[PDB]
Design an enzyme around this catalytic site. Structure first.
Site, PDB file in Angstrom:
ATOM      1  N   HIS A  40       0.850  -1.235   0.000  1.00 50.57           N
ATOM      2  CA  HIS A  40       0.000   0.000   0.000  1.00 50.57           C
ATOM      3  C   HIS A  40       0.880   1.279   0.000  1.00 50.57           C
ATOM      4  O   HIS A  40       0.348   2.364  -0.078  1.00 50.57           O
ATOM      5  CB  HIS A  40      -1.019  -0.012   1.245  1.00 50.57           C
ATOM      6  CG  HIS A  40      -0.676   0.551   2.628  1.00 50.57           C
ATOM      7  ND1 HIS A  40      -0.457  -0.137   3.716  1.00 50.57           N
ATOM      8  CD2 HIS A  40      -0.571   1.873   2.964  1.00 50.57           C
ATOM      9  CE1 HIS A  40      -0.228   0.702   4.687  1.00 50.57           C
ATOM     10  NE2 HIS A  40      -0.296   1.935   4.247  1.00 50.57           N
ATOM     11  N   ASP A  84       0.191  -7.499   2.094  1.00 46.60           N
ATOM     12  CA  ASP A  84       0.640  -6.091   2.024  1.00 46.60           C
ATOM     13  C   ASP A  84       2.170  -6.025   2.120  1.00 46.60           C
ATOM     14  O   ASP A  84       2.737  -5.600   3.102  1.00 46.60           O
ATOM     15  CB  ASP A  84       0.019  -5.297   3.173  1.00 46.60           C
ATOM     16  CG  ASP A  84       0.115  -3.776   2.904  1.00 46.60           C
ATOM     17  OD1 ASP A  84       0.313  -3.400   1.750  1.00 46.60           O
ATOM     18  OD2 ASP A  84      -0.010  -2.941   3.794  1.00 46.60           O
ATOM     19  N   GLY A 175       2.273   6.936   8.390  1.00 51.54           N
ATOM     20  CA  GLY A 175       3.664   7.462   8.184  1.00 51.54           C
ATOM     21  C   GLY A 175       4.680   6.368   8.540  1.00 51.54           C
ATOM     22  O   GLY A 175       5.812   6.319   8.077  1.00 51.54           O
ATOM     23  N   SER A 177       3.846   3.158   8.168  1.00 54.07           N
ATOM     24  CA  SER A 177       3.498   2.087   7.167  1.00 54.07           C
ATOM     25  C   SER A 177       4.684   1.656   6.329  1.00 54.07           C
ATOM     26  O   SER A 177       5.436   2.489   5.873  1.00 54.07           O
ATOM     27  CB  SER A 177       2.476   2.545   6.141  1.00 54.07           C
ATOM     28  OG  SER A 177       1.198   2.699   6.776  1.00 54.07           O
ATOM     29  N   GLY A 178       4.809   0.368   6.138  1.00 53.15           N
ATOM     30  CA  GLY A 178       5.931  -0.111   5.338  1.00 53.15           C
ATOM     31  C   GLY A 178       7.096  -0.363   6.149  1.00 53.15           C
ATOM     32  O   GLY A 178       7.937  -1.095   5.701  1.00 53.15           O
TER      33      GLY A 178
HETATM   34  N1  LIG Z   1      -3.127   1.709  14.177  1.00 50.25           N
HETATM   35  C1  LIG Z   1      -2.026   1.374  13.547  1.00 50.25           C
HETATM   36  N2  LIG Z   1      -1.147   0.578  14.107  1.00 50.25           N
HETATM   37  C2  LIG Z   1      -1.770   1.849  12.249  1.00 50.25           C
HETATM   38  C3  LIG Z   1      -0.626   1.391  11.582  1.00 50.25           C
HETATM   39  C4  LIG Z   1      -0.333   1.811  10.303  1.00 50.25           C
HETATM   40  C5  LIG Z   1      -1.182   2.688   9.700  1.00 50.25           C
HETATM   41  N3  LIG Z   1      -1.141   3.222   8.533  1.00 50.25           N
HETATM   42  C6  LIG Z   1      -2.183   3.991   8.417  1.00 50.25           C
HETATM   43  C7  LIG Z   1      -2.426   4.753   7.259  1.00 50.25           C
HETATM   44  C8  LIG Z   1      -3.481   5.663   7.236  1.00 50.25           C
HETATM   45  C9  LIG Z   1      -3.710   6.453   6.113  1.00 50.25           C
HETATM   46  C10 LIG Z   1      -2.893   6.348   5.007  1.00 50.25           C
HETATM   47  C11 LIG Z   1      -1.833   5.451   5.007  1.00 50.25           C
HETATM   48  O1  LIG Z   1      -0.969   5.323   3.928  1.00 50.25           O
HETATM   49  C12 LIG Z   1      -0.825   6.254   2.848  1.00 50.25           C
HETATM   50  C13 LIG Z   1       0.205   7.322   3.297  1.00 50.25           C
HETATM   51  C14 LIG Z   1       1.348   7.291   2.273  1.00 50.25           C
HETATM   52  C15 LIG Z   1       0.844   6.469   1.094  1.00 50.25           C
HETATM   53  C16 LIG Z   1      -0.158   5.497   1.691  1.00 50.25           C
HETATM   54  C17 LIG Z   1      -1.601   4.656   6.119  1.00 50.25           C
HETATM   55  O2  LIG Z   1      -0.545   3.765   6.032  1.00 50.25           O
HETATM   56  C18 LIG Z   1      -2.946   3.981   9.513  1.00 50.25           C
HETATM   57  C19 LIG Z   1      -2.286   3.158  10.297  1.00 50.25           C
HETATM   58  C20 LIG Z   1      -2.622   2.760  11.589  1.00 50.25           C
END
Ligand SMILES: NC(=[NH2+])c1ccc2[nH]c(-c3cccc(OC4CCCC4)c3[O-])cc2c1
Ligand SMILES: [Ca+2]
Length: 223
Positions: A40, A84, A175, A177-178
């Site tokens: 993602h 993912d 932020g 993520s990944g």
């Molecule tokens: N509760 C958690 N442990 C958690 C972990 C990772 C997450 N990632 C995200 C998330 C929310 C909105 C957009 C995202 O990605 C976009 C930002 C950059 C491109 C993709 C997220 O990864 C929520 C989120 C919540």
């Protein structure tokens, strides 16, 4: 990271920032030319940033390398976030040293109760946005599958695990993520999703890396 602390410059040498004019996701260095992140987080125009601590200032140790190709898992489903995971090949190999180093892939899955370190430059507030300049860390335990599944009924697949605190306050967030979830020196998870951040009874959900070790190896070997 919410409820986390400042990791310290370069204390997490395998952490990378994925940037496209601003930091949007994390990733883990697994070898001089390959990084693993979340499917993602895919987009075009990604420059990988290694040796970073403060993402808004150049302070030394940084290596900015454009991505040559991103390989999103063939079975990634953006609606369930199953599979993912994504691999990014760098245009050139990174110089590894003590500040930039790869992390090892696991030989076995980890068990609930294992304590893991999660890092990232994601949001630090659960209610609102506050993005840090420096890398934040959080120590969190992997949870049992029954607690994970009772938390997100019908949304957990076998390629996912939950880690965190059910009382809330400490969790990964947007932020982050990944990025990496390292347990006993092995990359066991990839920050993937959760409901809100640091909310009670809503732990983070991570991509279960041990289930992709063969896919990662076959793919790097053929690219
Ligand atoms: N509760 C958690 N442990 C958690 C972990 C990772 C997450 N990632 C995200 C998330 C929310 C909105 C957009 C995202 O990605 C976009 C930002 C950059 C491109 C993709 C997220 O990864 C929520 C989120 C919540
Ligand atoms: Ca910097």
């Amino acid at each position: 990271i919410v409820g986390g602390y400042t990791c310290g410059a370069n204390t997490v040498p395998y952490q990378v920032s994925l940037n496209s004019g601003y930091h949007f996701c994390g990733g883990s260095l697994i070898n001089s030319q390959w990084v693993v992140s979340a499917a993602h987080c895919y987009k075009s125009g990604i420059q990988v940033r290694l040796g970073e601590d403060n993402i808004n200032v150049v302070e030394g140790n940084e290596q900015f390398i454009s991505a040559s190709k991103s390989i999103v898992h063939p079975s990634y489903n953006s609606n369930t976030l199953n599979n993912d995971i994504m691999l990014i090949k760098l245009k050139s190999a990174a110089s590894l040293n003590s500040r930039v180093a790869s992390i090892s892939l696991p030989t076995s899955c980890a068990s609930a109760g294992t304590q893991c370190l999660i890092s990232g430059w994601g949001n630090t507030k659960s209610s609102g946005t506050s993005y840090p300049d420096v890398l934040k860390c959080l120590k969190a335990p992997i949870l049992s599958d029954s607690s994970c599944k009772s938390a997100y009924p019908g949304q957990i697949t076998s390629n996912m695990f939950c880690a965190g605190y059910l009382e809330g306050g400490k969790d990964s967030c947007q932020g982050d993520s990944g990025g990496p979830v390292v347990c006993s020196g092995k990359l066991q998870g990839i920050v993937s999703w959760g409901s809100g951040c640091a909310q009670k009874n809503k732990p983070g959900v991570y991509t279960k890396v041990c289930n992709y070790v063969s896919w990662i190896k076959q793919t790097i070997a053929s690219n």
